Design an enzyme around this catalytic site. Structure first.
Site, PDB file in Angstrom:
ATOM      1  N   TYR A 170     -57.131 -49.302  -6.451  1.00 38.69           N
ATOM      2  CA  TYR A 170     -56.615 -48.789  -6.588  1.00 38.69           C
ATOM      3  C   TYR A 170     -55.680 -49.316  -6.093  1.00 38.69           C
ATOM      4  CZ  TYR A 170     -53.611 -44.084  -6.769  1.00 38.69           C
ATOM      5  OH  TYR A 170     -53.119 -43.206  -6.899  1.00 38.69           O
ATOM      6  N   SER A 223     -47.439 -45.450  -5.430  1.00 42.66           N
ATOM      7  CA  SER A 223     -48.582 -44.613  -4.805  1.00 42.66           C
ATOM      8  C   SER A 223     -47.618 -45.434  -3.222  1.00 42.66           C
ATOM      9  CB  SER A 223     -50.109 -44.773  -5.145  1.00 42.66           C
ATOM     10  OG  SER A 223     -50.254 -44.195  -3.461  1.00 42.66           O
TER      11      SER A 223
END
Ligand code: NAD
Ligand code: NAD
Ligand code: NAD
Ligand code: NAD
Ligand code: NA
Ligand code: NA
Lengths: 260, 260, 260, 260
Positions: D155, D142
């Site tokens: 995350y 990401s």
């Protein structure tokens, strides 16, 4: 502290550089200052370093956009100080415009001062530091040496360049007793930033302090300016023994800018 | 300096953590120490902090690979100190093997201690710091939070994780008077590294000091170890006012490792 | 593929640039090539693009160390092509020396070509791309735009600068249909690297292929060169629809250089 | 293209993973898909890969938050395919909350799936790839593997971990014919992001498409979502010969997120 040390700070007649010089003098270093401004103001600053902090201080005027003038400045600084232990490459300018409108002469001026002067000053200082087996080169880069913003092509390019050059300097002098690091500040409310605040204020039709808040909010999560005194403190840390093995890196004081 | 401050250092019975605790106590903080070792050695360290530096010190045994034990440790530390101003998340372990041979239980252990304990300790500390409007969270990551080496999958993953978590912590608490930063050391000659030096020495059939030189030469351009005292000095700097707007970043003391 | 597209590659008379031009022509773009070399060799390359790949090709000689010559080159390229969809800013030079010995004229030459020409070429190209709502600017930086090596101050500074400039370009043109990215290769065995291999071979007293192995082993974990064809493939990818939202970033093809 | 190749994509019953599987099947690979969903939907997807693209496809249900289940999944995938050339470690989950409120079980779940499953899947795949001297491991990280946002501690930590693990994998397998890279997308409008858009819309009292615009504007300069098809194209590029020396790095398709 830095009693006995001999320091040079470029662009130290005002702004961040003057706070750098002040913290170094407070720590006991003799200091060469440099930069433009009103002669009476500059002499007041020089004499203040001496009378407040009991060190020697010298002002050497040199336009560091000229390579030979930069190299000659270092030589003159070392002669004045009787050595050169700490070099803070701070002088810089800014100009905002999009790339396709960005004046060629402004590109050249920003590369010359913000990048090339760091190279020429380092090149001149290094042999002095190499012969004594101790040195600190402290380059003032920016958050814009790590990330970009619109309308700052020359400055971002230059500051990224400074970060690269810092790494090379460090590696070439690894183990020699000389370190080189780049302080990477976020917004600091000097005249270089006040001009940008004023420009926002006119674009948005708002008061200056509202515009300062908008400038912070866009980039700097803490919503507070970094101060010149904080940066001076970082320079003093870099110059300390604790930082003997800190070399080739960036020290970001940016209120979270680069964390996101 | 840090007179009056209340500090907790995980994994401070030896190595880097003990040097952290020492520098914080020297600066005037009361300190909670933590970690494994011989009871008599740990008590000598606790009592030494008090008798040398005139601060209060407490040892709280907690295995920080357990989430609830970490959260309970923080609560007990804050109760002992009467507050919690500075948390240094330092405890960590290492295990080297290539990925396809890397023990699953070692992966789990390294993630638990080196990454998850940072999360759980931060989570417990933050509300205390938020209520007083001042705090420092100092995570001990590594050069391996920024770059990789072979045979260190779990550790590199964990340390990269710590760098990410540091950023999130900083952003969530931006402007609140709380900063969070990650110190990223290169090689420091503790027992965690002595084991790796010994392993090289056996692989290569060389004496230990030759093996230490080989370990440095591969990674660390300065060819010198970083010291625990230097790192303690960095922690004290991070805890200072000069670092009020230093948040969400990494402070590499790595002898040039990450410059190349 | 790129049928109908109009591409310009600087420094495409040989090396990486010529492979870039070739892959773009293969994909169906008309191409302007540029750079120095023997007139007969350059004309053979131009005519080969046409006869192998059925596209139009033009050679425009311009010394891109001159700002106005670069800006005029872009204008002439766009006139020849009837537009300008893809600009690959590739031309570059190298010179190795330590900072304190690094020739001032070599610093200036490397900054001029490797950094400033990227700015001037981008500035000239952008209005064309902005008016048509589609463009690709592909800057050839280096692993040395992200990390440093000794004796490469000017080059590392320039390449870091290119990475910064790439980011600014991307942000200024975000959403406009124009992307800007930097390909960051590790070692590619062109004449720019063969000179460095030869220099190692003389320093070490070894054959050239042993010296090539030593050059790789120091920096590039795969122990294999990156090829110009691979880089051409990366450029074609950047020019594709899959890369419409790839902008402002670096694409490292470096055999692991920057992973450690 | 990838005729004959054998690919596994975790979390490919929907979202990005399903687009990955589709592009790989289009390029001629046989594919193992994986993940949760309605049995009839999953079987329709499996049978569609076969009937549209003329490849073999298999669905293997495995909850990859369990280490042994992940390792067993890889073994079963390789058995089904008759080999394993390309592994795309894609499955992931999200949960937003500030650190001091972040559920411990959600921390554990996100670390287990988003980080640990990448390790266990890689560990299982590598010996297969090592024996055949060719492989691609493509980890879906990401922008949050490189930078942070508030309320995403687990995350961001996990994704940073994935970036580190990618580097280690690459270095351990350098030169072996196996590369490992991390694709780092910005916002992609899957259900993982639709939930966040819905949450903004309720916080702000605005329609969903206004909320989607606000989500983009904060992070993603292009003001457009990245598509799953674009990401599939990036995976196909990584799997190509042009990417033979692309290893240990991140490929950001993020609309400029990380440029600023
Ligand atoms: N203010 C910020 O927010 C900020 C943030 C990050 C980095 N920086 C950097 O900090 C450094 C100092 O910036 P500042 O904000 O204090 O700016 P400033 O404009 O307040 O001060 C600039 C200083 O440089 C001197 N100077 C200018 N041109 C010169 C030349 N050609 N030769 C010699 N000296 C010259 C000026 O006389 C002055 O002393 C610059 O490199 C700037 O890029 C500033
Ligand atoms: N030594 C280095 O070169 C180096 C470099 C960079 C980062 N680091 C990091 O610095 C930190 C300290 O490393 P060190 O070299 O001092 O190691 P060390 O092995 O000397 O000390 C580790 C400390 O952690 C404690 N500890 C171990 N497991 C624990 C557990 N489950 N719960 C609580 N405490 C526990 C030990 O008792 C000891 O006090 C680690 O996070 C390490 O990753 C070390
Ligand atoms: N070879 C590598 O390992 C490597 C790795 C990373 C990046 N790079 C970069 O790739 C680019 C191409 O390098 P290369 O290895 O193909 O080098 P090369 O020396 O083989 O080719 C350089 C090209 O630039 C042209 N050129 C030189 N000076 C010029 C000028 N003033 N104006 C216009 N054209 C000029 C030359 O005629 C030639 O066409 C350079 O930017 C270099 O920094 C190369
Ligand atoms: N959507 C984005 O903006 C975005 C951006 C960057 C990265 N990512 C990453 O892309 C990957 C895919 O995300 P997405 O947006 O397609 O999400 P999604 O929720 O649409 O799909 C997740 C997939 O993973 C599967 N899955 C969930 N838990 C699982 C488990 N325990 N075991 C096996 N499979 C499981 C689901 O069934 C589904 O197939 C994730 O790693 C995510 O972090 C997404
Ligand atoms: Na590196
Ligand atoms: Na950023």
């Amino acid at each position: 502290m830095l009693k006995g040390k001999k320091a040079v700070v470029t662009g130290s007649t005002s702004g961040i550089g003057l706070a750098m010089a002040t913290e170094l003098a407070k720590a006991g270093a003799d200091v060469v200052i440099n930069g433009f401004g009103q002669p009476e103001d500059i002499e007041r600053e020089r004499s203040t370093l001496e009378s407040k902090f009991g060190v020697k201080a010298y002002y050497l005027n040199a336009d560091l956009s000229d390579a030979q003038a930069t190299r000659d400045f270092i030589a003159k600084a070392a002669e004045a100080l009787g050595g050169l232990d700490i070099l803070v490459n701070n002088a810089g300018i800014q100009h905002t415009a999009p790339i396709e409108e960005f004046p060629v002469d402004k590109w050249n001026a920003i590369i010359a001062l913000n990048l090339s002067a760091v190279f020429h000053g380092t090149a001149a200082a290094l042999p002095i530091m190499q012969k004594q087996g101790w040195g600190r080169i402290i380059n003032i880069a920016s958050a814009h040496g790590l990330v970009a913003s619109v309308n700052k092509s020359a400055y971002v390019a230059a500051k990224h360049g400074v970060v690269g050059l810092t790494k090379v300097t460090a590696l070439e002098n690894a183990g020699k007793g000389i370190t080189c690091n780049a302080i990477c500040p976020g917004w600091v409310r000097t005249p270089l930033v006040e001009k940008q605040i004023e420009a926002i204020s006119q674009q948005k039709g708002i008061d200056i302090e509202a515009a300062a808040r908008e400038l912070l909010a866009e980039k700097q999560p803490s919503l507070q300016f970094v101060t010149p005194e904080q940066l001076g403190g970082a320079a003093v840390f870099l110059s300390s023994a604790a930082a003997d093995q800190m070399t080739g890196t960036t020290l970001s004081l940016d209120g979270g800018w680069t964390a996101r």
